[PDB]
Amino acid sequence: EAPNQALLRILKETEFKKIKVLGSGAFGTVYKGLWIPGEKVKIPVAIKELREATSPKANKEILDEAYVMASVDNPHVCRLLGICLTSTVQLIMQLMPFGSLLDYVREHKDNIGSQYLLNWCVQIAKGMNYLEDRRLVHRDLAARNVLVKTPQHVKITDFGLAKLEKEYHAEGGKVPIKWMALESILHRIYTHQSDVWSYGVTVWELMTFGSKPYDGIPASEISSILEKGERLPQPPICTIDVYMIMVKCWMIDADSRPKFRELIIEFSKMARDPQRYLVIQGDERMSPTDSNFYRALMVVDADEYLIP
Amino acid sequence: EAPNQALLRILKETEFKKIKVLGSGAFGTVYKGLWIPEGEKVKIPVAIKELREATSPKANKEILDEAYVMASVDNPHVCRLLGICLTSTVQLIMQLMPFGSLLDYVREHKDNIGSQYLLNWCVQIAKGMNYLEDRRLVHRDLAARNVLVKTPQHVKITDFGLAKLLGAEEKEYHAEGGKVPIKWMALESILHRIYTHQSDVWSYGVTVWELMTFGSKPYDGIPASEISSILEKGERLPQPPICTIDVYMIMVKCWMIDADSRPKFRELIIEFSKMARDPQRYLVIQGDERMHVDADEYLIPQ
Numbered sequence: 118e119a120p121n122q123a124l125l126r127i128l129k130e131t132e133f134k135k136i137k138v139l140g141s142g143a144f145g146t147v148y149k150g151l152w153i154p155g156e157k158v159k160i161p162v163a164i165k166e167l168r169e170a171t172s173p174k175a176n177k178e179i180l181d182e183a184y185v186m187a188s189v190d191n192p193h194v195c196r197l198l199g200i201c202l203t204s205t206v207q208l209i210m211q212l213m214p215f216g217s218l219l220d221y222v223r224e225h226k227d228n229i230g231s232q233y234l235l236n237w238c239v240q241i242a243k244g245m246n247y248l249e250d251r252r253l254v255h256r257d258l259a260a261r262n263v264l265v266k267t268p269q270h271v272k273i274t275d276f277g278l279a280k281l282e283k284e285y286h287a288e289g290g291k292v293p294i295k296w297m298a299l300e301s302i303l304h305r306i307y308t309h310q311s312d313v314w315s316y317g318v319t320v321w322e323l324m325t326f327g328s329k330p331y332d333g334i335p336a337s338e339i340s341s342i343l344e345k346g347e348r349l350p351q352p353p354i355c356t357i358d359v360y361m362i363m364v365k366c367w368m369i370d371a372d373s374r375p376k377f378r379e380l381i382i383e384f385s386k387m388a389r390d391p392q393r394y395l396v397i398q399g400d401e402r403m404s405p406t407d408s409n410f411y412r413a414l415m416v417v418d419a420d421e422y423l424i425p
Numbered sequence: 426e427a428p429n430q431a432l433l434r435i436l437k438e439t440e441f442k443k444i445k446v447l448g449s450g451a452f453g454t455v456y457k458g459l460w461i462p463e464g465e466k467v468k469i470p471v472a473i474k475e476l477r478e479a480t481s482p483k484a485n486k487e488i489l490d491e492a493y494v495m496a497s498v499d500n501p502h503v504c505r506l507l508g509i510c511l512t513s514t515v516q517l518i519m520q521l522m523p524f525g526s527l528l529d530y531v532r533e534h535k536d537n538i539g540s541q542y543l544l545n546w547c548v549q550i551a552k553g554m555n556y557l558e559d560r561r562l563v564h565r566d567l568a569a570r571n572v573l574v575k576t577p578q579h580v581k582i583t584d585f586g587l588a589k590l591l592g593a594e595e596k597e598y599h600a601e602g603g604k605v606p607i608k609w610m611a612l613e614s615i616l617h618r619i620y621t622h623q624s625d626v627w628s629y630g631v632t633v634w635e636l637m638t639f640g641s642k643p644y645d646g647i648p649a650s651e652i653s654s655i656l657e658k659g660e661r662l663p664q665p666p667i668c669t670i671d672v673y674m675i676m677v678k679c680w681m682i683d684a685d686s687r688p689k690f691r692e693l694i695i696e697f698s699k700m701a702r703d704p705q706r707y708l709v710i711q712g713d714e715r716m717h718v719d720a721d722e723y724l725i726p727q
């Protein structure tokens with residue numbers, strides 16, 4: 118092949134501070150974080166820290182993870198800012214100052230634009246197919262995990278990636294029942310076509326402007342309702358053609374579900390004529406702005422600093 | 426062009442129960458069923474089609490394609506689906522025509538069929554067809570068995586399983602093999618697996634035949650393989666005794682070898698509608714003068 122000249126940066130624990138715990142696992146936990154660096158600018162980040170300081174196998178995994186993430190390089194997949202070799206290893210993953218898409222969309226639903234909505238689907242499909250070109254399974258696609266660099270540019274977190282042979286099992290605790298494919302629910306296994314299922318759901322959240330999927334429904338019921346053939350309802354904005362794309366992602370059979378390269382083609386094709394495929398009231402006139410998540414930090418994007 | 430806001434509704438199978446089987450196919454089965462919408466307090470009669478297996482993506486893709494068309498078309502003589510069921514084997518839920526296939530209907534009631542109805546049915550079939558020509562969709566399996574009778578007054582088209590949608594770029598669609606029965610298909614479709622709206626007209630001509638003869642089998646004696654020869658030989662379906670030369674002529678044009686020569690559906694509505702003004706003249710039937718908790722498709726619409 119070719120040399121992987123990916124830079125790995127080692128940051129001191131003093132350099133970064135962890136605001137709050139976003140998620141927890143049997144091994145390791147993930148914190149919302151602020152990184153400073155002696156520079157004026159502050160950078161929002163996600164930090165993954167091993168729960169346990171002394172497990173050879175866990176340490177081997179966390180280093181491979183840091184190897185893949187640093188190895189990853191795509192406009193729509195979060196860059197790995199660096200790692201810090203405490204006894205408990207931590208990995209720093211860039212976060213965008215404006216925040217996540219899900220929150221962003223709820224804040225701006227009134228002013229939201231149809232072209233932007235089709236454009237985000239093409240972008241997420243690009244990151245996922247990039248990820249899938251290497252044999253890499255995201256295991257958690259959702260609108261909270263899609264980050265807004267700018268309203269035109271979004272990126273998806275690559276934390277906790279699993280690399281393939283056909284399928285990989287994953288146990289962490291705090292699992293997201295609603296976004297997972299039924300196959301994943303019953304047997305706790307994740308494939309690319311399972312990730313597509315989560316992709317379908319993500320698009321739904323975008324289309325409804327951030328309504329909660331299967332809202333007010335217990336997680337135990339969800340596995341059964343999927344067997345009965347219930348699925349998410351049509352987004353009022355959505356055309357039948359767009360909805361069909363979501364429906365195919367929610368097909369019980371894995372192979373029936375669309376492959377990611379397909380999804381990129383389709384959405385870019387619909388992106389050429391967005392107004393025919395998505396109908397939003399007062400669609401023609403609607404503006405880029407700061408976000409509520411971004412307000413709390415009040416920040417600098419990581420990508421701009423690193424450029425020099 | 427315009428956005429398609431036709432809406433497809435997902436329904437959990439617990440919402441509907443199946444009282445009885447209307448018909449069997451190798452693809453799968455159609456059930457008579459009562460559908461209760463959750464929350465809503467009405468009972469809707471419905472027909473549910475269910476495939477034999479969810480095993481194959483192609484099977485999966487075609488049903489999803491079929492369901493997409495049946496939801497997107499809205500015509501008074503095109504049967505519409507109420508919703509879909511994402512179960513492992515996908516389920517199709519459609520408005521129920523209680524009476525059944527027209528072909529079934531004609532044989533049982535041959536003694537009572539007035540000339541107007543036969544003309545009135547012909548008009549209605551064409552009207553639905555003509556809509557599908559507008560929608561760029563070729564039905565690809567028209568027969569009196571695929572024409573259902575919600576009521577004698579009203580009839581709707583059915584079984585879009587074979588139907589394919591033409592590309593704007595391409596005037597005609599060609600598909601490998603022939604799933605469909607030979608007798609209905611136009612000669613170009615048998616020889617070259619070519620299908621066009623004009624090829625649908627040919628099948629239309631066979632559907633009218635079936636009505637005018639009260640459902641007798643086309644080329645009833647003949648095995649399917651021979652049929653391609655006889656058409657080339659020039660034999661065709663014989664004059665329905667009830668039929669005048671003016672009406673039968675119309676069926677002749679449909680089974681013309683040259684597809685562009687045969688009538689367009691638009692024409693067929695006007696030609697059969699004009700006959701429908703003065704039916705006795707254009708159709709001769711003995712005793713013709715003598716011859717004449719709730720849910721519905723209507724209910725769903727405002």
Ligand SMILES: Cn1c2ccccc2c2c3c(c4c5ccccc5n(CCC#N)c4c21)CNC3=O
Binds near residue numbers: 455472504519521526
């Ligand atoms: C065979 N059959 C009937 C027989 C007696 C009474 C009704 C039907 C019927 C109906 C439908 C269908 C229908 C809808 C889509 C596809 C096929 C349908 N069939 C039979 C075709 C097969 N298989 C239907 C059908 C759809 N609504 C029906 O009533």
Ligand SMILES: [Cl-]
Binds near residue numbers: 139140261
């Ligand atoms: Cl999370």
Ligand SMILES: [Cl-]
Binds near residue numbers: 292295
């Ligand atoms: Cl959940």
